[PDB]
Every structure is written in C-alpha cells, then in structure tokens.
Amino acid sequence: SHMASRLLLNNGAKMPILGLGTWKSPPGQVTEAVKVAIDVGYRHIDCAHVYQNENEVGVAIQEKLREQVVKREELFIVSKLWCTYHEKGLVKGACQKTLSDLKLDYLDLYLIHWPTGFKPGKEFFPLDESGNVVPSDTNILDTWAAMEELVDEGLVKAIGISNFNHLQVEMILNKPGLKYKPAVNQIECHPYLTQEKLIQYCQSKGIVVTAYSPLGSPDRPWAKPEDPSLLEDPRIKAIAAKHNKTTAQVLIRFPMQRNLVVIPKSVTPERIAENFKVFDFELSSQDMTTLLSYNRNWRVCALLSCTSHKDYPFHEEF
Ligand SMILES: NC(=O)c1ccc[n+]([C@@H]2O[C@H](COP(=O)([O-])OP(=O)(O)OC[C@H]3O[C@@H](n4cnc5c(N)ncnc54)[C@H](OP(=O)(O)O)[C@@H]3O)[C@@H](O)[C@H]2O)c1
Numbered sequence: 376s377h378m379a380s381r382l383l384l385n386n387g388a389k390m391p392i393l394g395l396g397t398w399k400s401p402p403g404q405v406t407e408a409v410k411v412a413i414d415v416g417y418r419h420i421d422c423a424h425v426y427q428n429e430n431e432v433g434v435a436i437q438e439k440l441r442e443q444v445v446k447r448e449e450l451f452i453v454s455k456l457w458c459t460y461h462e463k464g465l466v467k468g469a470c471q472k473t474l475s476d477l478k479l480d481y482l483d484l485y486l487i488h489w490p491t492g493f494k495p496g497k498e499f500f501p502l503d504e505s506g507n508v509v510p511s512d513t514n515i516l517d518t519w520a521a522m523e524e525l526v527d528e529g530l531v532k533a534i535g536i537s538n539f540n541h542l543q544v545e546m547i548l549n550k551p552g553l554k555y556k557p558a559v560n561q562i563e564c565h566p567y568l569t570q571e572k573l574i575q576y577c578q579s580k581g582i583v584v585t586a587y588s589p590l591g592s593p594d595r596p597w598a599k600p601e602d603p604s605l606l607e608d609p610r611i612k613a614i615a616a617k618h619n620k621t622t623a624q625v626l627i628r629f630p631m632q633r634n635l636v637v638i639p640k641s642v643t644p645e646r647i648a649e650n651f652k653v654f655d656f657e658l659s660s661q662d663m664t665t666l667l668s669y670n671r672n673w674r675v676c677a678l679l680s681c682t683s684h685k686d687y688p689f690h691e692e693f
C-alpha cells in the first residue's frame with residue numbers, strides 16, 4: 376500500500392496514522408473493544424473526558440500493559456480538555472483526572488476539545504434559562520498557555536487543538552510568547568466534508584490533521600433519515616467493490632492517503648479488525664479526486680447549541 380504506519384509530529388514524536396475512536400462506545404463494551412483493538416494492531420486510542428468512558432478504556436489499556444501485549448512506549452493515547460475546564464486553574468486537574476481514569480502517567484497527545492470555553496461546574500453544557508450555552512471569559516490563548524504548562528510538567532508529550540477554524544489556528548500560531556506549536560488539529564473529515572482549505576493550511580504549518588467521524592458517524596444521536604449516508608453511497612461502494620474492500624475500508628484509506636491520521640470508532644470486534652486492514656491496498660489518484668468530488672460541506676458535529684459563542688468555529692469559511 377506504500378503506507379507507513381506512523382507519521383512525524385512537530386514535537387519530534389511519531390503518531391500512528393490509524394487510531395480507535397471511543398465516542399459513543401458504551402462503558403460496558405469499550406473495555407473489550409480496546410482490548411481487541413490492541414490485539415489486532417491498533418496502537419493509538421482516541422479518548423475524551425466528555426465521553427464518560429475513560430475509566431473503562433483505561434481498564435483495557437492497563438490489562439494489555441500488564442499482560443505485556445504491548446509496552447507503554449508503543450502506545451499513543453490521546454485525550455481532550457473539555458470546554459468547562461478552559462480556566463487556567465482547572466486545566467491541570469482536568470488533565471490529571473483523565474490520566475487517573477486512563478491509568479496512565481502521561482498522555483502522548485492532549486487536545487483542546489473545542490475553541491469554546493463554557494462556565495465551570497458539574498454540567499458539561501451549562502445552559503441559561505433560555506437554553507443557550509453559558510460561556511466562560513477565558514480566551515483560547517490563555518488556555519493554550521495552560522496546555523503548554525502540561526508539557527513542561529511531564530503530564531503530556533504533545534499538545535494540540537480540535538475543531539479550530541483556520542483563523543483560530545492562526546491566532547495560536549501568532550500568540551505572543553508562543554512556546555509550543557499545536558502538534559495536531561483534529562477535525563471532522565470525510566467525502567461529504569473534505570476540508571481542503573483547512574487541511575492545506577494546517578499542513579503548510581507543520582500541523583498534522585486528524586480526521587474524525589470518517590465513516591459519517593452513523594450512530595450520532597441526532598441522525599435523521601434524510602441525511603446523506605457515506606456507508607450507503609453507491610458511488611463509494613462501487614470504488615470499494617473495484618478494490619475488493621469494504622466501503623468502510625475505503626473511507627478509512629481515503630484520509631490516510633491525504634497524510635491525515637484517522638480514528639474510526641467501533642465496539643464490534645469483527646469491524647475493529649476489518650477497519651485496521653487498510654494497509655494492503657491503494658486508492659488511485661483518480662479514486663481520491665472522485666471521493667473528494669463528493670463534498671457537500673455536510674457536518675455531523677456542528678455544535679448547534681453554541682452558535683452564538685464568540686469562539687464558535689463554523690461561521691468562517693474554513
Ligand atoms: N470533537 C471531536 O474532536 C470529535 C468529534 C467526533 C468524533 N471524534 C472522534 O472520532 C471518532 C470516530 O468518529 P465517530 O464516532 O463520530 O463516527 P465514525 O467512526 O465515523 O462511525 C462510527 C459508527 O460506524 C460504525 N462502524 C464502524 N466500523 C464499521 C464498519 N466497518 N462497517 C459498518 N459500520 C461501521 C460503528 O458501529 P459499531 O461501533 O456498532 O461497530 C459506529 O456506529 C469518535 O469515536 C471520537 O473518538 C472527535
């Protein structure tokens with residue numbers, strides 16, 4: 376497939392280009408899912424405190440470490456700082472809680488989950504009397520400085536951002552006194568939301584892009600029948616058929632050939648294995664351009680409750 380398993384980040388570390396997603400993976404199933412993934416070759420797991428399943432993911436990681444199926448140095452564990460913890464004095468604790476839950480002493484990568492900070496408290500989405508999200512007066516630059524401290528304290532090897540538009544990425548890159556550049560911007564990306572502008576921009580700066588919801592997140596809670604469906608798109612199934620692969624495998628191989636990292640989620644053992652079997656074939660440049668042609672700027676994750684937040688990322692073109 377002419378395809379290396381890892382790429383180089385701007386912190387000097389290598390990141391496996393294929394990871395296991397864990398959003399929506401039920402806590403009673405995610406431990407098995409992660410164990411199976413490690414058994415069949417995954418070395419990169421994507422996590423978040425807001426997913427509420429980090430403890431159970433941690434159980435799997437710890438068993439595989441204890442059993443010497445894999446060494447810690449071979450794993451690449453990613454988590455994300457939730458929006459209610461953007462305050463300077465809350466970032467370390469949030470990171471430590473994630474570390475404790477995952478049963479790790481460091482993260483390979485820690486991302487600001489969204490550019491939008493919310494009021495701190497027990498609620499992940501604090502709403503006013505009217506149902507609008509209650510912002511915090513923290514800005515992304517001070518949050519970034521807090522993230523940089525995590526590196527200097529040994530808690531995380533790399534820091535990054537997620538759902539940042541190109542102007543927000545630029546704000547960080549131009550932050551006065553910037554100490555560490557974002558290593559990664561994790562964004563939604565698939566044939567219905569191809570992200571050429573943002574990807575090219577990030578890559579030109581040495582920022583690696585991770586593509587999330589690469590299968591179109593068919594299990595997203597807000598899905599409706601009228602929504603397009605990547606996995607059922609006959610045009611994509613045709614390309615898969617031509618290559619004797621599954622539609623999902625094509626959808627995973629797609630971002631890989633764009634020098635993106637990709638993190639398909641599954642709790643199904645058979646699909647976990649299938650999804651990893653994407654290093655044995657190549658999409659043609661024609662295949663790639665054809666898949667790109669399907670773009671319709673359609674977002675699974677639009678964060679509709681925060682469209683008035685000053686830092687809402689999706690008003691901008693890219
Ligand atoms: N803000 C953010 O940074 C953000 C936002 C969204 C997602 N993410 C990350 O990206 C990960 C992946 O995105 P996602 O969870 O939104 O959706 P996704 O990976 O595009 O799709 C997951 C869905 O696809 C199904 N599936 C997986 N493999 C399949 C296969 N081979 N054939 C048919 N169906 C298959 C899964 O079913 P089963 O599980 O039942 O097998 C699940 O319903 C997330 O888990 C999360 O880690 C991050």
Ligand SMILES: CC1=C(CC(=O)O)c2cc(F)ccc2/C1=C\c1ccc([S@@](C)=O)cc1
Pocket residue numbers: 398423425426427500675676677678679680
């Ligand atoms: C896009 C999205 C994701 C994926 C992500 O951020 O990784 C997510 C993950 C969670 F664990 C919880 C909520 C969300 C979410 C959007 C969202 C959902 C509900 C609400 S309340 C209005 O019902 C508001 C926003």
